[PDB]
């Protein structure tokens, strides 16, 4: 989607403590949004373990079943490294895989 949070007011920069201001929220139709407003001095003390969208895609990429940036030793190695299985009626089929994780590089 595309959730954006911005100021509703266009003037009165640095408002007074306790002042009413308008929070403007643009986002996808039908979505439910959760909020929290934190002093930044908490984050100056401890900014670890903050969740973000980039870490979400990082967790998904760590859950990927493909292990190689393409190609392969043969047609079977192409599918097996990509994360696919193939089996034909003539007999040609992919290599057997019994491990969930990717093989580790020599490094």
Partner 1 sequence: TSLPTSNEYQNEKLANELKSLLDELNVNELATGSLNTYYKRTIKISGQKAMYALKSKDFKKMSEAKYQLQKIYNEIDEALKSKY
Contacting positions for partner 1 (CB under 8 A) = 16, 18-20
What residues contact residue 59 under an 8 Å CB cut-off, 6+ apart? none
CB of 15 to partner 1, least distance (A): 11
CB of 19 to partner 1, least distance (A): 7
Q: Please provide the DSSP assignment of 46-100 as one string.
A: --TT---HHHHHHHHHHT----SSS--SSHHHHHHHHT---B-SSS-BPPP---S
Q: In the complex with partner 1, which residue's Cβ is closer, 20 or 96?
A: 20
Q: In the complex with partner 1, which residue's Cβ is closer, 14 or 88?
A: 14
What letter would DSSP give residue 12?
-
CB of 22 to partner 1, least distance (A): 12
| Contact between residue 66 and residue 82 where contact means Cβ atoms under 8 Å apart | yes
CB of 23 to partner 1, least distance (A): 15
Q: In the complex with partner 1, which residue's Cβ is closer, 4 or 16?
A: 16
């Amino acid at each position: 989607g595309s959730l954006v949070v911005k100021s509703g007011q266009s003037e009165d920069r640095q408002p007074v403590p306790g002042q009413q201001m308008t929070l403007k929220i643009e986002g996808d139709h039908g979505a439910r949004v959760v909020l929290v407003a934190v002093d930044k001095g908490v984050f100056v003390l401890n900014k670890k373990n903050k969740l973000t969208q980039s870490k979400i895609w990082d967790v998904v990429e760590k859950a990927d079943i493909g292990c190689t940036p393409g190609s392969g030793k043969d047609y079977a190695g192409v599918f097996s490294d990509a994360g696919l299985t193939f089996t034909s009626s003539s007999g040609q089929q992919t290599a057997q895989r019994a491990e969930l994780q990717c093989p580790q590089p020599a490094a």
